[PDB]
Amino acid sequence: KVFGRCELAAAMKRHGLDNYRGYSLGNWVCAAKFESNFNTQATNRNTDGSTDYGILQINSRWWCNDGRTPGSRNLCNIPCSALLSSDITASVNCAKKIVSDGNGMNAWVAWRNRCKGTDVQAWIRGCR
C-alpha cells in the first residue's frame, strides 16, 4: 500500500503515534516519507546483511525476525514480513519500542538527516 500524506498521518494518529515520546505527527510522517516513500511494502538490504522493513524501515538487526540476519534480536517479537502489511499496526507498535530505546527518533538515520529540526508540521499541513 502506498499511503497518501494525510492518509498516513491519520493512520499514525489513530494508532497513538502523534506526540508519542514527544514526537509530533509531522515527525512521524516525515520519517515515513524518507524511509519508505509511504510504501508499506518497502524493503532495503543493509551492508551488514540485515534488512529494513516497511513504512518505517525497521531493521532486522534488532527488532524483527527475518530468519537471515545472523546474531540479530527480535525485540518487537514479530516476523519482519508483518511490518509490510497494509495495516500499519505492527509497524507502529514496534516503532513505539524503537523510539523509546533511548535515542528518540535518531534511530531513524533518515529522520536525523532529513527531518530533524525542519518544519515537520508541513507534512501534516491541510490534513483533516
Binding site for Na ion (CB under 5 A): 60, 65, 69, 72, 74
Residue closer to Na ion, measured from CB, 40 or 65: 65
Instruction: Mark 95-114 with x for binding to Cl ion (rule: CB under 5 A) and - for no binding.
Output: ---------x----------
Which set of grid coordinates corresponds to residue 20?
508519542
How far lies 88's CA from each of 17, 59, 72, 97, 119, in Å? 11, 16, 23, 14, 24
93 forms bridges with which residues in the sheet?
none
Residues classed as catalytic: 35, 52
Residue closer to Cl ion, measured from CB, 79 or 104: 104
Residue 91 amino acid letter: S
**With binding defined as CB under 5 A, does residue 24 bind Cl ion?**
no
- Tell whether residue 101 is among the known ligand binding residues: yes
Residue 58 amino acid letter: I
Residues of this chain that interact with Cl ion (CB under 5 A) are 104
